[PDB]
């Protein structure tokens, strides 16, 4: 029941969208948010 942006340490890589942070980028890295 995650909201829209992408949660903290949280895979982001997979919606082609970013942290909910409005200067954290994708981390398809470790797939997570950066």
């Given at each position: ?6 949660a903290?340490?949280?895979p ?17 890295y ?5």
């Amino acid at each position: 029941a995650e909201k829209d942006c992408i949660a903290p340490g949280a895979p982001c890589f997979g919606t082609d969208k970013p942290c909910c942070n409005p200067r954290a980028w994708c981390s398809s890295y470790a797939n997570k948010c950066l």
